[PDB]
Design a protein around this nucleic acid. Structure first.
Ligand SMILES: [Mg+2]
Ligand SMILES: [Mg+2]
Ligand SMILES: [Mg+2]
Ligand SMILES: [Mg+2]
Ligand SMILES: [Mg+2]
Ligand SMILES: [Mg+2]
Ligand SMILES: [Mg+2]
Ligand SMILES: [Mg+2]
Ligand SMILES: [Mg+2]
Ligand SMILES: [Mg+2]
Lengths: 109, 216
RNA sequence: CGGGGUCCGGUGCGGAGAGCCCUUCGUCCCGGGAAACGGGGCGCGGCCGGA
RNA sequence: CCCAUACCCGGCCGUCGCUGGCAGUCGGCAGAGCGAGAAAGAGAGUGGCGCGGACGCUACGCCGCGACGAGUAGGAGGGCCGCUGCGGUGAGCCUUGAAGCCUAGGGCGCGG
RNA sequence: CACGGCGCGUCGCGGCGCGCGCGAGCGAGCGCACGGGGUCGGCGGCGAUGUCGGCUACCCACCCGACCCGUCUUGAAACACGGACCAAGGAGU
RNA sequence: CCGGGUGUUACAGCCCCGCCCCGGCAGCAGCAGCUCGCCGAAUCCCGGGGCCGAGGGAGCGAGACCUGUGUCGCCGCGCUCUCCCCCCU
C-alpha cells in the first residue's frame, strides 16, 4: 500500500578531476550524512526506474512502458554519507540528479 | 562389530580438538587396543542355456567426448548445506515481508524449515496471509515477540508439502492445517493489547523517517 | 482591538522543523469510549476574503 | 577522506627463459609408477567367469611452469594479410549465373 | 606429554641415554574435513501477432575526454610551409 | 553580598617531608567504555560488505589365483575390530 524503498539521487560517476569511471556511480541517499550512518545501506539492492516508448514485459503483470536497471550498494564514499553503487549496466548520463530507489530486502537486521 | 562411540573430545574451535595426541592415546585406551596382521547371468531358454551379459556395450559412440573433471573437496550439494539463522529471529517473532505479493505485511514467524526457508504465517483471519515460506533475507525482524513455545504445529508440513505443483486451487488439507495452526496462534496474539490491529496494518515509509535511524 | 508598564512563566529553544498534521487492507454482526451542535454532499443561493 | 596506465591480488594476449616435458598408445602376448629432501636397480638369477579400457602425436605438433611488455631515427622476425602472371594440384566453382559494383543484413580476426 | 611392547638390555653414564632379536621394515577398514583454483543430488517467472534476444553496425541524447594532418626542427595547434574534393597513375629497380 | 587590609588553620583547603609491613586495601596502561604508552611465539574468537571462481583423465584397490570404481594425493582428525557406566528420544 505504501512506499517500501528509500530515496537516493544519482549525483555522478566515480571520477577524478579529468577522468571518470562510468562503471561505478555515486548516490546521495536522503537522510544519511555521515559515514557512521551508511553501514545500514551497504549491500542493499538499488534500482533506476524509468519509462520508455515501447512496451516491455514485466514480471507478474502485463507489459507496460516501465524499465529498470538493477544494481547494488558496494561501499561508502567520502565522509558525508555518499555511497558507491554498481549496476549491471552503467547508468546513462541523463540520470544525473534523478531518483534511484534503494530497497531493504538484502536485509541484515 | 562394536557400538560406535561418540567422539572423545568436544570441539574447542572448528578444526581444533580439546585434547592433544597423547591425551587421545590415553582416552581411547589404545595402549590395550594394539592390532597386528557379477557381470553375467546364466538363464534357461526353450537351445539350452545362455550366459546373458548384463551391462552390455553401447550401440553408438559419439563423434567426440569431453574429458573428466578434476577433483574438488569443499563443494557439497544444497541438500546438506549447513543452515544459518539470524539471531534476532526466534519463534514467535513479528516479521515484515519486503518483496512478496504481501509487501510490508506484519506476519508471525513459527519455524525454520529444513532447506533454510522460514515457515511463516500471520493468521489470515486478520492480515490475510496463509501458511507460507519466506526467505530469511527478504524480511525485517522487528523486536516484538509473542510466546508460542506452547503450541504444536503438524510434523507432516514441510518443504515437500509447500513445493509448487505442475490454476491453483486451495486444498482442504491446506484449509484444515491453517485452521489448526491459527486456532492456537490467535488467542496468544489477542492477549497482547492492540496487537491484532498492528498485524492488520501494513508497514510503509513516509517522508522524514529513515530506516537507518528508526529502530524496530 | 492595537501599542507601552508591572507581574508571572519558559530559555541548549517540548507553543520545537532534533518539530507538527494526515495516516489507507476492506467488509459483516453485537458492546463500550467521543459526537449528538457532528459527517457528507457542480446540493445549493448569497455575503465577504485577494493585485 | 578522494584518485594515476604506480603498487598488491585475479583473468586474458603476446614475448623471453627453463637450450623444461611427451615416441610409454610399453594391453588376456598387458598389468597402467618414476613429485619424491638426500649421487645412484619396483635389478636378474645360484647354494645353506565376463575378451574389456576416453583424448593424444599437422614432433615445423601438443603440453607445463616463472618473469616481463614505452618508443622516434634505425635493425630483425612472422604474416592461413593483399595485387598480377607462371609450374603443379583441387575428378575445384560457373548461363539453375563468373568477374565487377551497392547494401540500415549475419559474423570472424588485435590487425593487415 | 608427537610418552607407550617384550626382551638380549652396559650400545651405558648411573636407571635415563641408547645398541642387537622378536617370519625377520607388509593390520585393516569405514567416516568428517579451514586439506594440489565451484558447485548445488536448489529454485522462481514470462512467452503468437505482440512480445523475447541481436556486442558491433543506422540515427539521436547525455557525462567525461578531445587543437589538423604531413614535414624540417631543441622546440608545431601555430601569426612556419604543402593540402578545395574524388577517381586512376606514382617513387631503393 | 562585595571591595580593601592583617594573617598561617580557625566555621575551607593547598604543597613538601621520617615512619607506622614501600602503612593497609581494591585495581592496574583500568567498560569511572578517552588522564597519558610501546607491543603480541608476551594473541586468539566471532561477524559484516565488495570482486572473482582460472584450471579439468590427480587416481583408489584388485592380484597374473583379478580386471571393480570414479570422494583422489599431502595435511588435520573421528569410529570400530576391548570392556563398562550415565543421559535424552
Ligand atoms: Mg599479476
Ligand atoms: Mg614495445
Ligand atoms: Mg554506405
Ligand atoms: Mg570538457
Ligand atoms: Mg618542411
Ligand atoms: Mg630531431
Ligand atoms: Mg608566411
Ligand atoms: Mg620551406
Ligand atoms: Mg595552399
Ligand atoms: Mg592507386
Amino acid at each position: 500500500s505504501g512506499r517500501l524503498w528509500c530515496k537516493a539521487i544519482f549525483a555522478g560517476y566515480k571520477r577524478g578531476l579529468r577522468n571518470q569511471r562510468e562503471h561505478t556511480a555515486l548516490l546521495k541517499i536522503e537522510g544519511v550524512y555521515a559515514r557512521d550512518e551508511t553501514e545500514f545501506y551497504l549491500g542493499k539492492r538499488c534500482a533506476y526506474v524509468y519509462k520508455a516508448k515501447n512496451n516491455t514485459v514485466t514480471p507478474g503483470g502485463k507489459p507496460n512502458k516501465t524499465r529498470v536497471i538493477w544494481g547494488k550498494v558496494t561501499r561508502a564514499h567520502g565522509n558525508s554519507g555518499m555511497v558507491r553503487a554498481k549496476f549491471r549496466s552503467n547508468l546513462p548520463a541523463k540520470a544525473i540528479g534523478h531518483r534511484i530507489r534503494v530497497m531493504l530486502y538484502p536485509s541484515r537486521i | 562389530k562394536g557400538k560406535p562411540h561418540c567422539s572423545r573430545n568436544p570441539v574447542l574451535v572448528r578444526g581444533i580438538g580439546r585434547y592433544s595426541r597423547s591425551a587421545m592415546y590415553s582416552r581411547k585406551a589404545l595402549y590395550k587396543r594394539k592390532y597386528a596382521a557379477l557381470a553375467t547371468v546364466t538363464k534357461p531358454v526353450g537351445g539350452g542355456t545362455r550366459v546373458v551379459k548384463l551391462r552390455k556395450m553401447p550401440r553408438y559412440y559419439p563423434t567426440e567426448d569431453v574429458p573428466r573433471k578434476l577433483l574438488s573437496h569443499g563443494k557439497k550439494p544444497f541438500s546438506q548445506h549447513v543452515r544459518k539463522l539470524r539471531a534476532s529471529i526466534t519463534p514467535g517473532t513479528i516479521l515484515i515481508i519486503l518483496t512478496g505479493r504481501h509487501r510490508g505485511k506484519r506476519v508471525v514467524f513459527l519455524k525454520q524449515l529444513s532447506s533454510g526457508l522460514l515457515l511463516v504465517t500471520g493468521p489470515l483471519s486478520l492480515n490475510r496471509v496463509p501458511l507460507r515460506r519466506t526467505h530469511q533475507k527478504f524480511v525485517i525482524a522487528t523486536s516484538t515477540k509473542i510466546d508460542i513455545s506452547g503450541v504444536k504445529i503438524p510434523k507432516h508440513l514441510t518443504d515437500a508439502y509447500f513445493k509448487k505443483k505442475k490454476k491453483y486451487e486451495i486444498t482442504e488439507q491446506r484449509k484444515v492445517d491453517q485452521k489448526a495452526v491459527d486456532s492456537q496462534i490467535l488467542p496468544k496474539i489477542k492477549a497482547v493489547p492492540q496487537l491484532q490491529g498492528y498485524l492488520r496494518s501494513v508497514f510503509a515509509l513516509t517522508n522524514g523517517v529513515y530506516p537507518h535511524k528508526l529502530v524496530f
